[PDB]
């Protein structure tokens, strides 16, 4: 189901989204999940007496960057996580990031687009889904208890472990931990599939939900994005192995308030 079409990628499968002074195109879409059912109204935080910095064009655009390389080698449910805000955080994050750390609080929603184009003699299936409270880390900390690098952008892929007991942490054992995940239910999150067969692209938009109408970006990361693979990349001797996966994102109608003087640290 969707319009008439293909070897080549056609019509009601060609979509475009313009935002700011950055404009996108895909000639082989299957939708765009507006995850949950509502978007984000630049509804001012009721929390603050701060009549904040609103409707700035300059930050409300599409920042694009590379996540990783997909290749024949990888095993199912191996995964790659992208926390928002903390990856659009500075340098690579335009005027958004700047105004982002000059301010105490933000409240935004994200509109994401992950791209991975192949060829009709390629098999595989990439699962893309946005989940708020989730896990990052990239580590078991040094020498003193608690837990390595959530802000880092998983440089390489992590190993589906024959068992949650969600990478607990201080030399121990017996039993599980509150960072569990059942990568086996990991399709209750607003998601969308990327089937080299069907899909060259996948668009997801998600509203604002933390514990407070606005949160602080120096200790939390309300949503982590996950580009982890559910049916690997077979390739027949001829053919383009190098399956370059790219992601391009857009904060939707952020509302910043609580302004001050350029946050200082990232190792």
């Amino acid at each position: 189901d969707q319009n008439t079409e293909e070897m080549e990628n056609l019509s009601d499968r060609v979509a475009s989204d313009k935002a700011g002074n950055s404009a996108t195109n895909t000639q082989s879409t299957v939708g765009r999940l507006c995850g949950y059912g509502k978007s984000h109204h630049g509804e001012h935080p009721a929390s603050c007496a701060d009549t904040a910095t609103d409707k700035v064009l300059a930050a409300e655009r599409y920042y694009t960057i590379d996540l990783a390389s997909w290749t024949t080698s990888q095993e199912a449910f191996s995964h790659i996580r992208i926390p928002l805000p903390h990856v659009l955080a500075g340098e690579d994050g335009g005027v958004f990031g700047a105004t982002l750390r000059r301010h105490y609080l933000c409240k935004t929603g994200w509109r994401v687009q992950v791209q991975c184009n192949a060829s009709q003699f390629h098999a595989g299936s990439l699962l893309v889904f946005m989940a708020p409270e989730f896990y990052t880390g990239k580590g078991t900390k040094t020498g003193t208890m608690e837990p390595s690098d959530p802000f880092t952008m998983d440089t390489e892929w992590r190993s589906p472990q024959g068992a949650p007991t969600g990478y607990r942490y201080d030399s121990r054992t017996g039993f599980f931990a509150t960072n569990h995940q059942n990568q086996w239910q990991w399709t209750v999150y607003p998601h969308q599939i990327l089937n080299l067969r069907t899909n060259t692209t996948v668009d997801l938009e998600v509203p604002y939900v933390n514990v407070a109408p606005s949160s602080s970006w120096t200790q939390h990361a309300n949503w982590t994005l996950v580009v982890a693979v559910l049916s690997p990349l077979q390739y027949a001797t001829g053919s383009s192995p190098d399956v370059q996966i790219t992601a391009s994102l857009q904060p939707v109608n952020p509302v910043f308030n609580g302004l001050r003087h350029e946050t200082v640290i990232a190792q």
């Binding site: 603050c48 602080s216 001050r260 946050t263 200082v264």
Partner: protein, 174 residues
């Protein structure tokens, strides 16, 4: 130095420092406790709304000064220079006829409410520092004092709300 706190922010002839003062806004501070608001705010678990700091000058009438004032939210660190401070909610106070200034540090809070303060450590919720420094020195002709003291008085605005009665922390003063 004697730990003889006393009531005045006190100033002169020139350059601070990182100035004049600095008291945070942690409705449990060293400052605000003993104060009504802070004394009342305590027999209650949570607080919301805007706070107000009022500063009355006590110097000679033949004098003249000019102070910068600011609330700097948590995110980065405690300012260490006016320059660093100014980028926060503030008001340049011109010492004139009109003796006192009224300031008021908002409520720049994620949470709709905050904890009235019980400092099993400093946890994330609490927030604030208010600083103040001279933006021009405090000037004065011949026949008048170098030195001058200006009198401190906290209050809870037209926005202040305390809820959850409780009962603190058994003391027995001094």
């Amino acid at each position: 130095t004697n730990n003889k706190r006393y009531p005045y922010f006190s100033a002169t002839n020139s350059v601070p420092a990182t100035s004049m003062v600095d008291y945070q806004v942690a409705l449990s501070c060293s400052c605000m406790a003993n104060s009504m608001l802070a004394a009342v705010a305590r027999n209650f678990n949570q607080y919301r709304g805007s706070l107000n700091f009022l500063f009355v000058f006590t110097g000679a009438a033949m004098v003249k000064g000019k102070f910068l004032i600011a609330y700097t939210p948590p995110g980065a660190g405690k300012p260490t220079t006016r320059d660093q401070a100014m980028q926060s909610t503030y008001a340049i106070w011109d010492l004139g006829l009109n003796s006192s200034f009224n300031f008021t540090a908002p409520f720049i809070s994620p949470t709709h409410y905050r904890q009235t303060s019980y400092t099993s450590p400093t946890i994330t919720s609490v927030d604030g520092w208010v600083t103040v420094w001279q933006l021009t020195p405090l000037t004065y002709p011949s026949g008048t004092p170098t030195n001058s003291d200006i009198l401190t008085l906290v209050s809870a605005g037209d926005d202040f709300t305390l809820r959850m009665p409780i009962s603190p922390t058994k003391w027995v003063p001094q």
